[PDB]
Amino acid sequence: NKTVVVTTILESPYVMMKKNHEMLEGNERYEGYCVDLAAEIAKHCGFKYKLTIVGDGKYGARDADTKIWNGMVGELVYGKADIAIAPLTITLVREEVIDFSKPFMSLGISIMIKKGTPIESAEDLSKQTEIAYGTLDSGSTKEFFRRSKIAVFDKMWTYMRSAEPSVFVRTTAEGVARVRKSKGKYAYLLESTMNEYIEQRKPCDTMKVGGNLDSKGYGIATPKGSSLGNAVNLAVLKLNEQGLLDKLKNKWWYDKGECG
Amino acid sequence: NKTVVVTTILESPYVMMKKNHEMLEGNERYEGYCVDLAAEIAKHCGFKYKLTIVGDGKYGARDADTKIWNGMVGELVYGKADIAIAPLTITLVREEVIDFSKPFMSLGISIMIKKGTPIESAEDLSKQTEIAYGTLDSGSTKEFFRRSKIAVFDKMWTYMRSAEPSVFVRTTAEGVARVRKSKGKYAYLLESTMNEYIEQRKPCDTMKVGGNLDSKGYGIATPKGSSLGNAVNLAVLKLNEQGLLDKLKNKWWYDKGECG
Numbered sequence: 001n002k003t004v005v006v007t008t009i010l011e012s013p014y015v016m017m018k019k020n021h022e023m024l025e026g027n028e029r030y031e032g033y034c035v036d037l038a039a040e041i042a043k044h045c046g047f048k049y050k051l052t053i054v055g056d057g058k059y060g061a062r063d064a065d066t067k068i069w070n071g072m073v074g075e076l077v078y079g080k081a082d083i084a085i086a087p088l089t090i091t092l093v094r095e096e097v098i099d100f101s102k103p104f105m106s107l108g109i110s111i112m113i114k115k116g117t118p119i120e121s122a123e124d125l126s127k128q129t130e131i132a133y134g135t136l137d138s139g140s141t142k143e144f145f146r147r148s149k150i151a152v153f154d155k156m157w158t159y160m161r162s163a164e165p166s167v168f169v170r171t172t173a174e175g176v177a178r179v180r181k182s183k184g185k186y187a188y189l190l191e192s193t194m195n196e197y198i199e200q201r202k203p204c205d206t207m208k209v210g211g212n213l214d215s216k217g218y219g220i221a222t223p224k225g226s227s228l229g230n231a232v233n234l235a236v237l238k239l240n241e242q243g244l245l246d247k248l249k250n251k252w253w254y255d256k257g258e259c260g
Numbered sequence: 261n262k263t264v265v266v267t268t269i270l271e272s273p274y275v276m277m278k279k280n281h282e283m284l285e286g287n288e289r290y291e292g293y294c295v296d297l298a299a300e301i302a303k304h305c306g307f308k309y310k311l312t313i314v315g316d317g318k319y320g321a322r323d324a325d326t327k328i329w330n331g332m333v334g335e336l337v338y339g340k341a342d343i344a345i346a347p348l349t350i351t352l353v354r355e356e357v358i359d360f361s362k363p364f365m366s367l368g369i370s371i372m373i374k375k376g377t378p379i380e381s382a383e384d385l386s387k388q389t390e391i392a393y394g395t396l397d398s399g400s401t402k403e404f405f406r407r408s409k410i411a412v413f414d415k416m417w418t419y420m421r422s423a424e425p426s427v428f429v430r431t432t433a434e435g436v437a438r439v440r441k442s443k444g445k446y447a448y449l450l451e452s453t454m455n456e457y458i459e460q461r462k463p464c465d466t467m468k469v470g471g472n473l474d475s476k477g478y479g480i481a482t483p484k485g486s487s488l489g490n491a492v493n494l495a496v497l498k499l500n501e502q503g504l505l506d507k508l509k510n511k512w513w514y515d516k517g518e519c520g
């Protein structure tokens with residue numbers, strides 16, 4: 001056996017740098033939901049591993065011109081990593097080039113507003129211009145709007161793609177900061193899981209409104225045909241059935257909430 | 261190519277017999293969410309099919325003594341059917357003998373009460389005896405309680421397994437009828453999807469209370485190693501991404517609701 005290389009991404013509260021990480025070594029430098037999940041998966045599958053942060057800090061997309069895959073998906077496709085354990089959305093285009101376990105978390109696209117903003121739904125956003133709105137610049141949320149045939153979402157994409165200045169952000173933290181510093185003039189579309197986490201963090205000035213726009217899940221990914229695929233899938237099902245996944249979400253989202 | 265044999269189960273609103281089914285033929289005898297889903301999957305995967313109702317009317321369990329699998333799972337394992345398209349829960353023990361697509365629907369175990377019953381949670385049920393409660397006699401809901409290590413659910417299973425008369429029912433319709441005819445002295449534990457459907461059907465005397473006890477999903481199943489597996493999985497992802505699955509749930513659950 002050989003040490004398994006795990007690729008993941010810095011995204012709270014899935015993977016975060018510990019306070020004195022600069023003086024720590026190996027897997028000890030990180031903490032979070034996916035760090036805990038990686039330890040459980042490795043134990044039940046019988047392997048040793050090394051956590052690494054994706055080089056380009058992206059989730060995974062295919063360049064239309066070069067046909068090259070970037071992000072965590074790219075690291076698996078080109079053999080730079082053996083497995084990805086992160087909040088990676090299961091999608092058709094990705095399933096065609098890598099394998100995914102059954103979902104370890106369920107979620108959907110949602111709306112985040114600065115408290116007091118006069119918006120209650122996607123419909124509301126699409127019918128006005130005073131309040132700007134956008135999504136992560138690369139990922140499944142942006143693709144959802146780009147390819148949607150649904151009236152409201154199609155109208156939203158038409159606005160977002162031409163809006164100036166750009167309404168797209170580089171990271172989740174950037175989107176949250178923009179909502180907080182825009183005095184209610186910017187609303188952010190992001191996955192419900194991240195929205196729910198931020199709502200319980202100081203300065204407690206944001207909130208999730210309306211229902212989710214869709215339904216999907218995050219899965220553990222492996223290179224197509226990997227010998228680890230089968231065991232990892234069974235491990236995810238085992239951990240969910242014994243209540244470990246629910247325990248971990250409570251641990252990183254609510255047990256330590258800062259807003260009451 | 262050969263006609264694909266689909267096994268499914270009579271469970272509203274997934275698969276139901278049309279009014280004059282006795283005078284109809286083939287796939288035309290049935291209607292419902294899974295009937296519509298089967299047509300879409302077959303079209304996108306390029307195959308012709310024949311719908312059949314599982315012989316023993318069960319979902320799928322393995323006899324501890326004979327080691328024989330029954331229900332829809334059994335039909336796939338022994339080669340009596342080529343694919344199962346029904347509200348079949350993705351579980352570890354089943355994943356070990358058959359293949360599942362990514363989920364086409366997300367759900368969780370829930371509580372159904374006759375309106376007015378003084379119960380608001382699983383905790384409430386576990387701390388009293390006046391109001392009896394049970395689950396489907398065979399399936400993932402019963403297994404959840406049987407194998408749970410969680411205090412409240414463990415206390416609930418201890419009560420249910422010895423309760424007299426039996427608190428377990430043969431079908432969902434039987435459980436609903438018992439709730440309706442017991443004057444509030446029987447509460448039923450069932451999947452949220454079925455609970456949500458019944459709440460919108462006359463005589464509009466039931467309701468779902470509390471949150472779900474767990475989180476899981478339904479998947480399309482095929483015999484392990486089947487050549488249909490890959491295409492069926494991609495088709496489920498395609499249908500979810502284009503909004504067809506959400507449209508179908510609204511069509512069979514809410515568009516025709518009977519309770520306002």
Ligand SMILES: N[C@@H](Cn1ccc(=O)[nH]c1=O)C(=O)O
Binds near residue numbers: 087088138139142
């Ligand atoms: N999980 C996504 C990435 N991602 C993350 C947060 C968010 O709000 N939107 C999004 O697309 C993916 O896998 O691309």
Ligand SMILES: N[C@@H](Cn1ccc(=O)[nH]c1=O)C(=O)O
Binds near residue numbers: 320432
């Ligand atoms: N989907 C289940 C069957 N099933 C259906 C309804 C319900 O309330 N509980 C249950 O276990 C399975 O696959 O066993």
Ligand SMILES: [Zn+2]
Binds near residue numbers: 040043044
């Ligand atoms: Zn463990």
Ligand SMILES: [Zn+2]
Binds near residue numbers: 303304
């Ligand atoms: Zn279609």
